[PDB]
Amino acid sequence: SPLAAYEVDDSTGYLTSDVGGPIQDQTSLKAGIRGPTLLEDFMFRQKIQHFDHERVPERAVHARGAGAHGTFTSYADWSNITAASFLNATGKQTPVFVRFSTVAGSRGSADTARDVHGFATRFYTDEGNFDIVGNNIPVFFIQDAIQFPDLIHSVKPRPDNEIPQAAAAHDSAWDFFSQQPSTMHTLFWAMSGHGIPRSYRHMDGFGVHTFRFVKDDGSSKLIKWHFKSRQGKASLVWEEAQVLSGKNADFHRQDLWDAIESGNGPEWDVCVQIVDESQAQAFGFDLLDPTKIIPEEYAPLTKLGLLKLDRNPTNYFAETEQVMFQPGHIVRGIDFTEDPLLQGRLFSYLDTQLNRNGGPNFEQLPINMPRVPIHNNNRDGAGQMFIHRNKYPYTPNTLNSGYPRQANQNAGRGFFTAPGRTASGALVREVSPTFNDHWSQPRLFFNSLTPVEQQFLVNAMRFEISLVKSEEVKKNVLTQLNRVSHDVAVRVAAAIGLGAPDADDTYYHNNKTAGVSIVGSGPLPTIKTLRVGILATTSESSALDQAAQLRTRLEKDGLVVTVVAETLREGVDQTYSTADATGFDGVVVVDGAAALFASTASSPLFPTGRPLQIFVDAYRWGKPVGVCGGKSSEVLDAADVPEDGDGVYSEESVDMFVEEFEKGLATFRFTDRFALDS
Amino acid sequence: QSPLAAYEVDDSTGYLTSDVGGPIQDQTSLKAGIRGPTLLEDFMFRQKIQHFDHERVPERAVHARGAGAHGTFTSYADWSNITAASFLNATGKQTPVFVRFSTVAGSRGSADTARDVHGFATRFYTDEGNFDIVGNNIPVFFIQDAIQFPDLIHSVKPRPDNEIPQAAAAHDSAWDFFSQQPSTMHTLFWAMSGHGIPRSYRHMDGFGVHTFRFVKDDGSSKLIKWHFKSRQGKASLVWEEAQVLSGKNADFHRQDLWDAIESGNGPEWDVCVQIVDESQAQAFGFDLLDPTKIIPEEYAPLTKLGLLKLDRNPTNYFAETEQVMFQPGHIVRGIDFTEDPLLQGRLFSYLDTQLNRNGGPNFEQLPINMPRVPIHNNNRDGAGQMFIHRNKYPYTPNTLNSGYPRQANQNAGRGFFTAPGRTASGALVREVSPTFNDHWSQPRLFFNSLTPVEQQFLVNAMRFEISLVKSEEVKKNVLTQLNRVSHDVAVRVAAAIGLGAPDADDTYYHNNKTAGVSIVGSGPLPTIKTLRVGILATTSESSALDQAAQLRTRLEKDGLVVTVVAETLREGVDQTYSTADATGFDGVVVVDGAAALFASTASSPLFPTGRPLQIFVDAYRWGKPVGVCGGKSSEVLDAADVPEDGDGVYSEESVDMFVEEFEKGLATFRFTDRFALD
Amino acid sequence: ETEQVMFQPGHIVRGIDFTEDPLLQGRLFSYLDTQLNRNGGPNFEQLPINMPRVPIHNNNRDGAGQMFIHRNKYPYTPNTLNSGYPRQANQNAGRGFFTAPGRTASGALVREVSPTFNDHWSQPRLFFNSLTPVEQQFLVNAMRFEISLVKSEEVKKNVLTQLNRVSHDVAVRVAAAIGLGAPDADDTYYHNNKTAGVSIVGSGPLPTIKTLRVGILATTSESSALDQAAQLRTRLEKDGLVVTVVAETLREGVDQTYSTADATGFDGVVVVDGAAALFASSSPLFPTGRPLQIFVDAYRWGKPVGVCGGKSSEVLDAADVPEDGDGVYSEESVDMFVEEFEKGLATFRFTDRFALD
Numbered sequence A: 001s002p003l004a005a006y007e008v009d010d011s012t013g014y015l016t017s018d019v020g021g022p023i024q025d026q027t028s029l030k031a032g033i034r035g036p037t038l039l040e041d042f043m044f045r046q047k048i049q050h051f052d053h054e055r056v057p058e059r060a061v062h063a064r065g066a067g068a069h070g071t072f073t074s075y076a077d078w079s080n081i082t083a084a085s086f087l088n089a090t091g092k093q094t095p096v097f098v099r100f101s102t103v104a105g106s107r108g109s110a111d112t113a114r115d116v117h118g119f120a121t122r123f124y125t126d127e128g129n130f131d132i133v134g135n136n137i138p139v140f141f142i143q144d145a146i147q148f149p150d151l152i153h154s155v156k157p158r159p160d161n162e163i164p165q166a167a168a169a170h171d172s173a174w175d176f177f178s179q180q181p182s183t184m185h186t187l188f189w190a191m192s193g194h195g196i197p198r199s200y201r202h203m204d205g206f207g208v209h210t211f212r213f214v215k216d217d218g219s220s221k222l223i224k225w226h227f228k229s230r231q232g233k234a235s236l237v238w239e240e241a242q243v244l245s246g247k248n249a250d251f252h253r254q255d256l257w258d259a260i261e262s263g264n265g266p267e268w269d270v271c272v273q274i275v276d277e278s279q280a281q282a283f284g285f286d287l288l289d290p291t292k293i294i295p296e297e298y299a300p301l302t303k304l305g306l307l308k309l310d311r312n313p314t315n316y317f318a319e320t321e322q323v324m325f326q327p328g329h330i331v332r333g334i335d336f337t338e339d340p341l342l343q344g345r346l347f348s349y350l351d352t353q354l355n356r357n358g359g360p361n362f363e364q365l366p367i368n369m370p371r372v373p374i375h376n377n378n379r380d381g382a383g384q385m386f387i388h389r390n391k392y393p394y395t396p397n398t399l400n401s402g403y404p405r406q407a408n409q410n411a412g413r414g415f416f417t418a419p420g421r422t423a424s425g426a427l428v429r430e431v432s433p434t435f436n437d438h439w440s441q442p443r444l445f446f447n448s449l450t451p452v453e454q455q456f457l458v459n460a461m462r463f464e465i466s467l468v469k470s471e472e473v474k475k476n477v478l479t480q481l482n483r484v485s486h487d488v489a490v491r492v493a494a495a496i497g498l499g500a501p502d503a504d505d506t507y508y509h510n511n512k513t514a515g516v517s518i519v520g521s522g523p524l525p526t527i528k529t530l531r532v533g534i535l536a537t538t539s540e541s542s543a544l545d546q547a548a549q550l551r552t553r554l555e556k557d558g559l560v561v562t563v564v565a566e567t568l569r570e571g572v573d574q575t576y577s578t579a580d581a582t583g584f585d586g587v588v589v590v591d592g593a594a595a596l597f598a599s600t601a602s603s604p605l606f607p608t609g610r611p612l613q614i615f616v617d618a619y620r621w622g623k624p625v626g627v628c629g630g631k632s633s634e635v636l637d638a639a640d641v642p643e644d645g646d647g648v649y650s651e652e653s654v655d656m657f658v659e660e661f662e663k664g665l666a667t668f669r670f671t672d673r674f675a676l677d678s
Numbered sequence B: 001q002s003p004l005a006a007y008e009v010d011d012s013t014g015y016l017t018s019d020v021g022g023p024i025q026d027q028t029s030l031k032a033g034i035r036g037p038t039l040l041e042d043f044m045f046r047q048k049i050q051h052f053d054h055e056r057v058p059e060r061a062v063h064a065r066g067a068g069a070h071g072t073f074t075s076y077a078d079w080s081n082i083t084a085a086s087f088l089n090a091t092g093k094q095t096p097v098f099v100r101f102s103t104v105a106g107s108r109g110s111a112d113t114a115r116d117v118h119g120f121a122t123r124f125y126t127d128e129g130n131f132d133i134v135g136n137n138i139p140v141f142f143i144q145d146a147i148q149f150p151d152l153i154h155s156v157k158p159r160p161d162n163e164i165p166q167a168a169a170a171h172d173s174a175w176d177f178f179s180q181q182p183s184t185m186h187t188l189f190w191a192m193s194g195h196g197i198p199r200s201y202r203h204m205d206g207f208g209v210h211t212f213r214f215v216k217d218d219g220s221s222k223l224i225k226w227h228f229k230s231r232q233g234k235a236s237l238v239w240e241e242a243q244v245l246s247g248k249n250a251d252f253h254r255q256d257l258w259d260a261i262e263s264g265n266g267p268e269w270d271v272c273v274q275i276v277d278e279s280q281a282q283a284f285g286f287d288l289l290d291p292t293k294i295i296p297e298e299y300a301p302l303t304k305l306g307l308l309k310l311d312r313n314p315t316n317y318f319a320e321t322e323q324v325m326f327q328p329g330h331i332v333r334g335i336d337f338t339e340d341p342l343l344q345g346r347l348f349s350y351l352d353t354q355l356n357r358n359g360g361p362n363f364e365q366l367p368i369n370m371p372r373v374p375i376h377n378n379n380r381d382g383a384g385q386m387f388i389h390r391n392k393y394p395y396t397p398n399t400l401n402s403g404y405p406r407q408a409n410q411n412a413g414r415g416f417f418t419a420p421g422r423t424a425s426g427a428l429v430r431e432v433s434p435t436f437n438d439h440w441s442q443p444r445l446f447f448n449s450l451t452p453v454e455q456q457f458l459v460n461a462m463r464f465e466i467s468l469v470k471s472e473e474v475k476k477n478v479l480t481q482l483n484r485v486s487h488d489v490a491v492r493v494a495a496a497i498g499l500g501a502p503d504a505d506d507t508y509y510h511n512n513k514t515a516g517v518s519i520v521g522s523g524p525l526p527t528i529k530t531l532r533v534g535i536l537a538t539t540s541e542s543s544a545l546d547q548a549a550q551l552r553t554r555l556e557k558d559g560l561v562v563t564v565v566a567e568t569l570r571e572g573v574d575q576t577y578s579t580a581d582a583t584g585f586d587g588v589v590v591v592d593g594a595a596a597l598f599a600s601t602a603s604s605p606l607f608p609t610g611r612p613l614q615i616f617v618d619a620y621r622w623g624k625p626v627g628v629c630g631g632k633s634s635e636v637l638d639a640a641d642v643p644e645d646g647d648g649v650y651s652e653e654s655v656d657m658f659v660e661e662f663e664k665g666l667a668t669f670r671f672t673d674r675f676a677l678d
Numbered sequence C: 001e002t003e004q005v006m007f008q009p010g011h012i013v014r015g016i017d018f019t020e021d022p023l024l025q026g027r028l029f030s031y032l033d034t035q036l037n038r039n040g041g042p043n044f045e046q047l048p049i050n051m052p053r054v055p056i057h058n059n060n061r062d063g064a065g066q067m068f069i070h071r072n073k074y075p076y077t078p079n080t081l082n083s084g085y086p087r088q089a090n091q092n093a094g095r096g097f098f099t100a101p102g103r104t105a106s107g108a109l110v111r112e113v114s115p116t117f118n119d120h121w122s123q124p125r126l127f128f129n130s131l132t133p134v135e136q137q138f139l140v141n142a143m144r145f146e147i148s149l150v151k152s153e154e155v156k157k158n159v160l161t162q163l164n165r166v167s168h169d170v171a172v173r174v175a176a177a178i179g180l181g182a183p184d185a186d187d188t189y190y191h192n193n194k195t196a197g198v199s200i201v202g203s204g205p206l207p208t209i210k211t212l213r214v215g216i217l218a219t220t221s222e223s224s225a226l227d228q229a230a231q232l233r234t235r236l237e238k239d240g241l242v243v244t245v246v247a248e249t250l251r252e253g254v255d256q257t258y259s260t261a262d263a264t265g266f267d268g269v270v271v272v273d274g275a276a277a278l279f280a281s282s283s284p285l286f287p288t289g290r291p292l293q294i295f296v297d298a299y300r301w302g303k304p305v306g307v308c309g310g311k312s313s314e315v316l317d318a319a320d321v322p323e324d325g326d327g328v329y330s331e332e333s334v335d336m337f338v339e340e341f342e343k344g345l346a347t348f349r350f351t352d353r354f355a356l357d
């Protein structure tokens, strides 16, 4: 690890300058006790110069994000399908670093914005660093990389006033979506729960593009990368996400950091779909088109290995802020395809690191370094940290005996372009007609959602498009939505007081695909790390005893228990003042605390009605809620929460209460609490 | 015409060109065949993507989140009797300005409504050079020596292992620093008051913080404090409102300012000074060099120098607001520095830090930084040099350029000059003046000057933040410092966190008060123009829409911003219930034709369960004027648990009588009787 | 290493301090700032050549190019969450740097020059008086060279005004080259004082001749010339001189061709007398007259020169070099030749070969 060598311990010692001279840094040097500061105060200037220069440009996209270290372990020797060294043996372990992100927001924007999310993975392999720079949505908005600045200018804030932050809910974004119909598939995913995932751990990763697996014999197959969550799939609801953005902008980064610290590091199966080169145009679309998925019914997933994140960074800036991913970080055994989106990405990620790092030696930062020797004739540049011993860095040479030697298909385990690849035809700036169906797959996706998930997606579009001020953009939006689904256009039009266009059935169909629905993906496979708020009181000795019994029972099963009361003490984690329903996956009231839920309840220690609002918000957002103790009746009445409700619990016995409540936590959301269009 | 019209680029017509004027396209990559790989010879692709890849610059090291506008400063008099400053030398003399407002801790995407200190930075483009006053909305600063700035800022910014939490002092490190560095107490009390969560940039004041000098053409000097006094009045959010608003509208302050300017409600401030003699530096019971102290207005009254009005929004946010580079080193003849060790070190920081932001030394050439008078100097070259200098002899002294440019000084060329009565005497020391040692009296002065509900809000802010501090040593240390300002504050805060306050230490306790620091105490707002009224209506009753239309006409006559809310958009409805929130309004009105939407059984797929009532309830609980217009008020007020006889609760059949009452409620702004007191 | 080394007078250690020299004072600012230009970022002290050889303990963080992974997640002072580390270093603890505690300041805040700085001419005259006569001539001749290339007549006149304040004789001798009259003597700062240690010509023979360069001019024509050169090489290399044998073409024992050779390549030049024919009144292998020109240039520039082997008149007469000149050597004995020649290398320059005013 080039990180180990660069760790700096300041647990002991006297303060020094950056050149090791012991100094102080608390008072400026002045001409007299009430005098002006001296230019000769080098202690002042070195410290303030460093401060003045701490910042670097944020990433042009995915500025908001968080990372962790872990390991990838291969399940098999995959030599039969790829030459890739990190996949060449059962049990072979490769260190990883992953960064998760949103896309549009700046640094400091909220984790729980509605957005596409990044899932970028570095494998520090024994044949070089290999990055899979993916997203949580398997399809992209655009079909050619040259359009990326158009997409991103349109979804980022309007450039006269820089409003709005971290949101596509503005005219320019919906203008672009409605004028560039390729956007429909990713737009449908972003308007689904996939736009507001419950955590980084509860979302999948996708390479998006078709890539190639290349064997040592030169043969190739076409692949798609899928990183399948072992925590299950889960979403927030929009109203909840909006509050959580305010209450805790750091929710996803905190969730990941806490899961790793608690020994619950998240896991994914790293999978591929594998298909023959001859199938590029066999599935009714082009595998070069990054707006399309291969339905799992046409190509099943093969599990290649386990990705586990299990160690947080030491210094966020040095590791997470400075990690510089590139799809150009490729290894022998993998190749590109002629996807015009992927093709232009390769240029962008090498160039942009010059902006971020301010100079060309960014691969020398410890987080970017490889775990194998570097042998090349790259030299000099600002921030050069190496002292090269070869004073003949040119090829061909005799004065360094021909080293470094060329690597290729037959030498030094070189990367090689898949030798079956060809190109033929005119040099054109033309789109393939095979890319022209922008609407069938958006429909496939929409069909594959549950009825309440379809409603959530319609309601997300109703929310955003109602904030578009241009009547002509809103009309154009309905024109494009109508090509995917007349019913979606009609339901969205109803919220904005416009008429939908007449049905246009060209791309309408009834087909569905497995594995894209969140609500449909069944109970969560584990409830470890899920958050339980216990609403108690210091008023009643019994209320703190009830809380402490629930705590033992719930903590047994790996739940993160927060006991909330008016004030802190032994056994109480948080005050009502700091508590919010967005902080919990389920909420339990101990019946000992009933008096806090009365309409007349008031305290200077928390805002009017806070205890009941927590319970009501949790219920209205679909969470498991209940009252534990015996007068379960009374609290449920104040909340207008029906005792016979799905995901509403009411037990005198703590043992019975928890057994029922933990099933609700796995169900995770009670969708019968949301109204559907007729 | 904008003051920067010479630099404007119009793209309302024309064909796409490269940056060198070659007509091009930018929508499809050049490929070897229609399904081929992209070509390196595609310069169209690479120039567009290189530009995109390099769009970002480092955010400001502090004050990264902010927003700006153009306007005019107008002098009320000829101030040559106190200052040589040209921009102040005649009655009615006009100078263009640019102002940026900001928070301090958050990154450039963080919420406007975080609790924080705020920036108020003003550039005067004077006829004798650019003059900047780089101020805050709080008149005192945390620390007494610039060399400590990185300590303060590291402690309040996110913890550097995981970069949590964003835009908040509510974590261990910050309260560790506050409790170990007692100078922080005065600013801390201001930040924990409503001055930490201002209602808008227009509803806060600006302060230079430091003592400066005014210097006459005869060389005599006076000591001054700058105060920019809002002509809009002072107003705050409540914390539990600010937290939701951070999620519902991270852009609230920048939108409020932008909208005020577009509506012809450009905000205004009286630019004022306190003026005292050089002999009064240590006359008021503290040192005028100490930036943790105010001069109570009872000791030195404000003199109004002129009017600051902001009335023009930027054309390009990045080019004007993101790129504006303020400096206290931007000083003009007639002003001088003081030996305040905080101001002293700032002068270094703001010249250096622009190298980080701009990437090169020619940042004063950016349009927003250029002066409006000629530049004559021997500065040359550097990256990004825009000027073509004719003078081939840029050294002094010269004969080959006839001795030009000529030296400017007190006696020639209207030169800047150091106040000539200034001296220094004594040892060259890294020592703090004992005159700086009282860190507690003025925090007590401030606390004493707040109303009772205001004192409660400040206690509650401290209770909120300190309850989130994990360390029991840090919480005890915080109570030790707060106890030196006020035993009552320490006891009340300690009650929320389950510790005992230490015994009273009355060394610094006193009962003195000072005018002009209280928000609650500053009486009704002088204008209600721009304040926001939400009218909750329904499409289900044509008569509810008629009530809303009649209310709109009458409220808009008085310059209120009216939003009619209903289930769906149509003519006369601005916003759906789905996108509406009480944080969007300064007052809420329900038309009694919509009373059915407030029923417990009310449900719609078009908005979250209970949304209409929650808007009314939140508005009431946050202290806003609320009412029901039309005569049938019982169903709504009873559903909301709001008493018809409450102060700032309105029930009238007559639209005219409703609006007359409700408008007095908007001027009152907050009904503080709805908040519990210890 | 060399291009990236970033020196600073702000790189100071306990036991050294600054003075109020206004030139030094402003340097402290410049050298910290300028490394931002060179490095493009604030972490230039992390470059290997700039790193210290002792631990770094401070709360500097982040910046482009940050190489460290800091473990201390509480980088502020004062702190309890990192137990108050790093600790402040000062005069009394941790071997801190400290400003000399006797230093004071007193007076107005001024942009004024100390009148104690105003004598700009006495020390130039002290320096000039301390040079030997030939060295004064060299200095006059450097000023005559440079000032003759100044196009402005008024600049040239202003230069003579200032030079005249140091020395009227300098002004007169410079003026003679540029066709101007010197201004009348102004004796305010004239004096006859001298100081030791500033003269090069007067600093006596070099204390070592190791590394000094001896060019041996030979020929491939005459196998005996190559034999003479080989014998001379052996004798000179024994004493640590760097020997170059020059001939028309390369072969074993010949280092350079006459085409690439120049008198500026040598501190001393020896012709072996077997090569005397090359010193007469042409070849496609080198420019016309090259062998003789190397000898003549070496002589004109003051170097020790000579002929080894016993026959010197043909070479020295072709060169217009007198056999009895100081720093001109002729011996048949290689040992004798080298003993005499080495004394000449230590003398280094024979300054009797330069004309004086």
Ligand code: HDD
Pocket: A059, A060, A061, A062, A065, A099, A100, A101, A117, A118, A119, A120, A133, A134, A135, A140, A144, A145, A146, A148, A207, A208, A209, A290, A323, A324, A325, A341, A344, A345, A348, A349, A350, A352, A353, B049, B053
């Ligand atoms: C032509 C430009 C372009 C295009 C078409 C894309 N991107 Fe990209 N992307 C960039 C240009 C870029 C960039 C400007 O080069 C960034 C900013 C920071 C960086 O390292 O690269 C970036 C960053 C970035 C990151 C953040 C990595 C990190 O955490 O540091 C992720 C996850 C993605 N992108 C993912 C994608 C996916 C899955 C794409 C489509 C399949 C995609 N991008 C298309």
Ligand code: HDD
Pocket: A048, A052, B060, B061, B062, B063, B066, B100, B101, B102, B118, B119, B120, B121, B134, B135, B136, B141, B145, B146, B147, B149, B208, B209, B210, B291, B324, B325, B326, B342, B345, B346, B349, B350, B353, B354
């Ligand atoms: C020694 C360093 C230091 C100290 C003691 C302070 N600041 Fe500062 N401040 C900076 C170093 C700095 C900076 C790093 O130089 C920034 C970042 C961006 C910039 O141009 O300057 C800055 C930015 C900055 C801005 C943003 C200007 C804009 O909108 O672009 C404001 C309003 C202030 N500061 C105000 C203050 C006030 C009122 C202070 C105390 C009275 C103060 N700062 C002390």
Ligand SMILES: [Ca+2]
Pocket: A158, A170, A171, A172, A173
């Ligand atoms: Ca827009």
Ligand SMILES: [Ca+2]
Pocket: A192, A193, A194, A235, A236, A453, A456, A518, A519
């Ligand atoms: Ca969902």
Ligand SMILES: [Ca+2]
Pocket: A358, B359, C040
């Ligand atoms: Ca740079």
Ligand SMILES: [Ca+2]
Pocket: A415, A416, A417
């Ligand atoms: Ca190849």
Ligand SMILES: [Ca+2]
Pocket: B159, B171, B172, B173, B174
């Ligand atoms: Ca902390």
Ligand SMILES: [Ca+2]
Pocket: B193, B194, B195, B236, B237, B454, B457, B519, B520
């Ligand atoms: Ca307040």
